[PDB]
């Protein structure tokens, strides 16, 4: 049967850019990931429009490779579908759709993934789903904050409500891509194309995105640039020349002061001023 068509990014170029910046998963795994995304995108029984590689989540007994597809409820934070695997080339599994309840409930805990999807998550701060739902909530929260793109590459199409990849976009020098004023968000905040410079600063007037460079000398002429996330350690964006990419590799844990949930409040009683025994007059 004829393989279906699909759009994607230059993934070998993404592996090259990440390797030049010193992040990601290397370049042998870059090849394996590109071939796996090919085997996904060219599948008849799965009519995919576009494939992307979200990143990798490290677990205790296994790991999660995560691909983000588009498939030719279906909007907001469920616009994309997510397929995960333990090893590249193994059988894939579609993650469920995310609900605001489990996003809000995972925002209160901090767990290590066990690498098994059919595992419990929490006892006291009750998480409504199993591990798969926690993973989906993590993916949603990370996508809302880290997936970005170079500025002026996309524009907001009013009527269709989508993004227009302009074809007169010129990248700056690689070492100028390491500024937070050179990237913008391309996922709804959970307005849209806001620069990374206007993020929530960390305690101490510290910017939430830190530069990464490809060479220690400012005189090399063709070098990459990029940013690394402070809030989500393991989330990196970076461009070299005309190519660029975002990815997340890590454990899934946020970088914020963690306060475990206190015991829940205790209920009060009825006001005594309105429930009191009456009496008749005295002699």
């Amino acid at each position: 049967d004829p393989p279906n068509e699909f759009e994607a990014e230059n993934m070998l170029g993404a592996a090259a850019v990440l390797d030049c910046l010193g992040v990601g998963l290397g370049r042998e795994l870059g090849v394996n990931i590109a071939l796996a995304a090919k085997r996904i995108g060219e599948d008849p029984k799965l009519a995919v429009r576009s494939v992307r590689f979200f990143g990798k989540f490290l677990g205790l007994y296994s790991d999660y490779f995560v691909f983000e597809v588009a498939f030719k409820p279906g909007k907001g934070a469920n616009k994309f579908t997510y397929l995960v695997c333990s090893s590249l080339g193994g059988p894939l599994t579609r993650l469920p759709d995310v609900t605001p309840a489990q996003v809000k409930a995972s925002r209160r805990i901090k767990k290590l993934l066990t690498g098994r999807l059919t595992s419990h998550v929490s006892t006291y701060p009750a998480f409504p789903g199993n591990e798969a739902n926690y993973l989906r909530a993590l993916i949603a929260r990370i996508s809302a904050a880290t997936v970005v793109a170079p500025s002026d590459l996309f524009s907001l199409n009013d009527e269709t409500g989508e993004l227009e990849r302009a074809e007169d976009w010129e990248p700056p020098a690689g070492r100028e891509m390491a500024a937070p004023t050179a990237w913008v968000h391309v996922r709804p905040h959970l307005d849209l194309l806001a620069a990374l410079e206007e993020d929530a600063q960390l305690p101490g007037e510290q910017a939430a995105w830190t530069p990464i460079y490809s060479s220690a000398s400012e005189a090399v002429k063709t070098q990459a640039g990029g940013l690394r996330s402070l809030v989500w350690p393991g989330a990196v964006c970076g461009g070299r020349g005309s190519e660029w990419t975002c990815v997340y590799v890590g454990w899934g844990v946020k970088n914020a002061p963690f306060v475990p949930l206190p015991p829940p409040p205790v209920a009060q009683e009825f006001a005594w001023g309105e429930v009191e025994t009456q009496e008749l007059e005295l002699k």
């Binding site: 419990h120 006892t123 006291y124 963690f258 209920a267 009825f270 005594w272």
Partner: protein, 191 residues
């Protein structure tokens, strides 16, 4: 002795003194939480057990309504023993947690497979409250309310250590006065 029913749906079965609760009493709140304990002047006072809607029991010694002093809180694989200031935890505490998610997944060391001790930990820690608050009214920063707990801090900077395995529900709480409370151990997991 008395039995009382309030227009919100809350009920009380216990002892009264001069038109208010006093002594032993069990109160059932509209939410489904049950407080079985000691009262004085129409409010919780003394040692009582409070099963909450989240199906977890909070013990301790209330004083003028609020849990004050050393208090323990329990859930299937959790236990928090710590100081409480005006119902809010503040000060020294100890968190005891068991790893329930991986009780049936294979162990990393062959020493644990046959060891008669479970995978429980124990961490000394402390909670923290804005300085001006915590006093008793008769400005100052406000206490940490429920949704946000704005101002509540938490500090732990030592290692955890091993601990004896926990069980749920704690026998200090039986007989259980609500429904849908699970049962946790290590030879059985969560039930």
């Amino acid at each position: 002795r008395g039995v009382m029913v309030f227009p919100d749906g809350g009920t009380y079965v216990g002892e009264f003194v001069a038109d208010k609760f006093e002594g032993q009493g069990q109160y059932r709140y509209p939410d489904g939480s049950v407080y079985t304990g000691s009262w004085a002047a129409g409010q919780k006072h003394g040692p009582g057990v409070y099963w909450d809607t989240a199906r977890g029991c909070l013990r301790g010694e209330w004083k003028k309504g609020l849990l004050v002093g050393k208090g323990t809180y329990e859930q299937p694989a959790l236990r928090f023993e710590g100081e409480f200031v005006r119902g809010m935890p503040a000060g020294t505490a100890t968190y005891t947690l068991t790893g329930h998610r991986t009780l049936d997944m294979p162990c990393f060391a062959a020493q644990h497979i046959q060891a008669e001790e479970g995978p429980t930990l124990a961490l000394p820690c402390a909670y923290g409250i804005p300085p001006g608050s915590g006093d008793e009214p008769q400005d100052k920063p406000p206490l940490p309310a429920h949704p946000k707990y704005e101002g509540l801090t938490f500090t732990a900077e030592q290692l955890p250590g091993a601990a004896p395995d926990t069980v749920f529900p704690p026998e200090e709480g039986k007989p259980v006065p609500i429904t849908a409370v699970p049962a946790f151990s290590v030879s059985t997991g969560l039930v």
